[PDB]
Amino acid sequence: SKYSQDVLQLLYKNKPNYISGQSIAESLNISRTAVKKVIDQLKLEGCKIDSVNHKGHLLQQLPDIWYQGIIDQYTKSSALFDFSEVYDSIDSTQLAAKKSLVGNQSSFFILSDEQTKGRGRFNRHWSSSKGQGLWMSVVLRPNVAFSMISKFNLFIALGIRDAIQHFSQDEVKVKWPNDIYIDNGKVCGFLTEMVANNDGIEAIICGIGINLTQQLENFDESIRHRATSIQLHDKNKLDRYQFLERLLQEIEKRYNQFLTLPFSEIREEYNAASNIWNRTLLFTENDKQFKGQAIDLDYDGYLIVRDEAGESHRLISADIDF
Amino acid sequence: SKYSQDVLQLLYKNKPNYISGQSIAESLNISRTAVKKVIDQLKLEGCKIDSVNHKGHLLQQLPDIWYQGIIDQYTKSSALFDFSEVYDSIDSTQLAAKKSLVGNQSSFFILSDEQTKGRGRFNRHWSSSKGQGLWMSVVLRPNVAFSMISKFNLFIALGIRDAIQHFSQDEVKVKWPNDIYIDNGKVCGFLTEMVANNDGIEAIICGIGINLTQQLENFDESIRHRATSIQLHDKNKLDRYQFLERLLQEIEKRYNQFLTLPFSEIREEYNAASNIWNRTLLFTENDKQFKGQAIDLDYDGYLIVRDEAGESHRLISADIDF
Ligand SMILES: C#CCCCC[C@@H]1SC[C@@H]2NC(=O)N[C@@H]21
Ligand SMILES: C#CCCCC[C@@H]1SC[C@@H]2NC(=O)N[C@@H]21
């Protein structure tokens, strides 16, 4: 109903104490019995709410669905983000963000349970199944030159990697400049875009797609060997809200470092997290393809590559296949 | 009515011959007498249409109003632009374009008779009065790295300057990197923005504001001495459609050169058109201001400046006051 989010919000707000129907009913100025129907609905949708006579209701566990109601709490208490928008299904959180940023200087992020037109780099199709990944776009407002985009993109990587690590028992590595892996499985893709002019950046839009709970069964047949989910490397149930919380916190930490540190500060760190070394990398550039080794990430985030013909290259970006 | 643009379109399409009401009536499958009411309305709005018994109607002169009807002809016959959108009044053609470009690869432009929230660089207020200027945003789709924005911005300048020249008896000069002048009056401001990622530009959005027909009386009192309009330097009535036609043609020419020539090809040309030489320029950078001379535009479009303390600078952009 009209009030599901409101009741959910109250339950989350009130943890770890119980609140009575009566009490919710008065907050919302709605009948006790309406509160009871909304509570039954939340249980039907898979909310885990303990209900005890006299005492009331306690939100125990959210299902794999995003609720504006709850996400609003993450934005109320946040220093970076003005608001968020949450959707059950949309063409793409990236398209939404690029539209929603126009005409304002808000910082915000967009989450959706599913995307019908999810896209990564080069307009490639990104699978965004309902129930199974965090499909998010983050719009921030750094006061910097447009060439700093590549820098943003390196700091944010380590933020994303750190959040995924906190949940996986296995080793999580960045594949420069835009992908995160656990062993041979891509568990995340991200994409930093900007709106900018010569005088600086109007907005950064970072689209982040992370596979949360797919079982292997769930992956398209061709990609099965090179794909994975945080679930498949975590002993406990992975809780999306718990993860989002961690992800937002890391983004903020890395975004602050992005504003205050030169790349050289995190370069070693980035280096150690990266999985592109000591191995033959396939590179694509327009028509061309060639093989190569990654020699180094210079102090400006450029990849130093020694190609199969012995020539050296200095790349701000690339698409690498393993 | 529902058909004004349609009838207008037919009149423009049919120049320099007359078409009868009957003939319009059959094209549109509407009554002769409805055609007559729509023709009276167009005359009321200030269209100059010669109407002769037996023979029909001939569009002689459009008023200072943009008509989707006519602009559609400019897009039908165009090699660069997929469509246009025309508005009588909007917050900003720049805001519209940044929204309208999302999710597609169309090239297009947006015109509006008036803007209620026109903005130039640094979110500065740009006056966009109904009836008096061309307030346009142009979205193009160059397949290039994001650092090429500054290059785009230099080629487009000369396109804009060339169109304004064709109509002014006086000398039209560019004030790098974003303004056009006739003597001491700014007659145009433009602004190149981009949407981009590390792999290249998704869209260029060039907002162009050009004062067409202001009399001095029309300019805010403070700015009167440093502002001007193409009208105030043209002996003939300035015809906005005629100008738009010229502007679109120049944009296309300079956009083609942008895709095919290095800056060094047009640098001399740019140099000769520029009005920033042999004079004390005031510069703003954040908190700072300082005075300076423009020594040179290097081969990469960077301004070489000798500041008042004798130090040299190499600037991709600046805001200069005379
Ligand atoms: C291919 C590939 C991985 C690129 C990351 C996709 C994220 S999902 C949320 C946001 N929305 C998109 O359409 N793309 C980004
Ligand atoms: C200050 C100043 C001049 C910047 C140019 C304004 C053009 S008008 C059409 C387009 N729409 C805008 O809001 N800005 C651009």
The CA-atom distances, in angstroms, between B103 and each of A119, A229, B143 are 10, 28, 16
**CA count, 13 A, side-chain hemisphere, B285:** 13
A200 to each of A42, A111, B151, B235, how far by Cα in Å?
46, 27, 15, 41
Q: Is A113 helix (H, G, I), strand (E, B) or coil?
A: strand
Residues of B with Cβ-Cβ distance to A99 under 8 angstroms: 99, 102
Å from A99 to nearest chain B CA?
5
* Cβ atoms A103, B91 nearer than 8 A: yes
- Resolution, angstroms, 1 dp: 2.7
Residue in chain A nearest B190 by alpha carbon: A197
Between CA A35 and CA A23 the distance in angstroms is 10
How close does chain B come to A286, measured CA to CA in Å? 11
Give CA–CA dist B146/B200, Å, rounded. Answer: 5
Amino acid at B320: I
* Dist CA B187 CA B240 (whole Å): 14
Chain B nearest C-alpha distance from A211 (Å): 23
Place of tokens 């190149």: B192
Q: Tokens in use for B50?
A: 């010669």
- The CA distance from B225 to B276, in Å, is 18
CB A196 to CB B103 under 8 A?
no
- Residue A86: its H or E element: strand A83-90
> Is B188 near ligand 2, meaning CB less than 6 Å away?
no
In degrees and rounded to multiples of 5, residue B227 shows phi and psi of -130, 155
DSSP string, A152-178: HHHHHHHHHHHHHHTT-SS-EEEETTT
Largest CA distance in chain A: 77
Provide the residue type at B179 as one letter. Answer: D
Q: How far apart are CA A182 and CA A172, in angstroms?
A: 5
In order of start, what are the domains of chain B with their CATH numbers?
A: 1-63 (1.10.10.10), 64-275 (3.30.930.10), 276-322 (2.30.30.100)
DSSP tag of A195: E
Tokens encoding B277: 């030489």
Residues in chain B: 322
What's the CA angle centered on B281, arms B275 and B285, to 5 degrees? 120
β partners of residue A268: none
CB contact under 8 A, A191 and B202: no
C-beta of residue A47 within 8 angstroms of C-beta of residue A8? yes
Buried b (16+ CB within 10 A) or exposed e, B225-236: eebbbbbbbbee
β-bridge mates for residue B57, sequence order? B19, B51
- The DSSP bridge pattern shows strands B83-90 and B108-115 to be parallel
Looking from the CA of residue A189, the nearest atom of ligand 1 is 3
Contact A202, B193 (CB under 8 A): yes
Q: Is the CB of residue A291 less than 8 Å from the CB of residue A280?
A: yes
Q: How big is the A-B interface in CB pairs under 8 Å?
A: 71
Length of chain A counted residue by residue: 322
Distance CA A160, CA A180 (A): 8
CA distance A296 to A278: 11
Tell me if A276 sits within 8 A of A282, measured CB to CB: no
| Pocket mutation for ligand 1, best pick of A91, A92, A95 (most atoms within 8 Å of C-beta) | A92
C-alpha A277/C-alpha A256 separation (Å) is: 28
CA distance B270 to A204: 32
Cα B279 to middle of ligand 2, angstroms: 27
For residue B260, CA distances in Å to A57, A142, B152, B266 come to 68, 33, 11, 12
Q: Which amino acid is at B255?
A: Y
Q: List, in order, residues 6 or more apart from A272 with CB less than 8 Å away.
A: none
Cβ atoms of residues B251 and B138 within 8 Å: yes
| Ligand 2 centre distance from Cα of residue B301 (Å) | 22
What is the Å distance from ligand 2's center to B154 Cα?
A: 17
The tokens describing A272, both together, are 């150690």
8 A C-beta contact, residue A105 and residue A141: yes
CA A293 to chain B, closest CA, distance in angstroms equals: 20
DSSP β-bridge partners for residue A180 = A174, A188
Measure CA A25 to chain center: 35
Strand runs labelled E in chain B = 48-52, 56-61, 83-90, 108-115, 133-140, 172-175, 179-182, 185-197, 200-211, 281-285, 288-297, 303-307, 312-315, 319-321
Rounded to whole angstroms, the Cα distance separating B135 from B211 reads: 9
- Give the tokens for residue A54: 């006299």
B169 in helix, strand or coil? coil
CB B182, CB B170: distance < 8 Å: yes
Q: Are B257 and B162 in contact (CB under 8 A)?
A: no
User: What is d(CA A36, CA A24) in angstroms, rounded to the nearest whole number?
Assistant: 10
Q: Give how far Cα A307 sits from Cα of A70, A177, A298, B198, Å.
A: 49, 18, 17, 21
C-alpha dist (Å) from residue B42 to A35, B3, B33, B134: 60, 11, 14, 21
Give the three-state DSSP class for A261.
coil
- Which residues are CB-neighbours of A245 under 8 A, at least 6 positions away? A74
B202, closest residue in chain A (CA to CA): A193
Among residues A259, A285, A254, the alpha carbon closest in space to that of A270 is found at A254
Q: Is the CB of A109 under 6 A from ligand 1?
A: no
Name the burial class of residue B187, with classes exposed (0-12), middle (13-18) and buried (19+) by CB atoms within 10 angstroms of its CB: buried
- Helix residue ranges, H only, B261-288: 264-273
Nearest-angstrom CA–CA distance, A100 and A306? 42
Give the Å distance between the CA of A82 and the centre of ligand 1. 22
3-class secondary-structure state, position B204? strand
Pair of tokens at residue B87: 């508005």
Do B197 and A177 lie within an 8 Å CB cutoff? Answer: no
CA–CA distance, A275 with A172 (Å, rounded to integer): 9
Residues 6+ apart with CB under 8 A from A39: A7, A21, A49, A51, A57
Please list the residues that pair with A203 across neighbouring strands. Answer: A195
Q: Which residues contact A236 (CB under 8 A, 6 or more apart)?
A: none
B171 token code pair = 């000398």
Cβ distance A202 to B193 less than 8 Å, yes or no, reads yes
Give the C-alpha separation, A91 to A264, whole Å.
38
Identity of the amino acid at A100: S
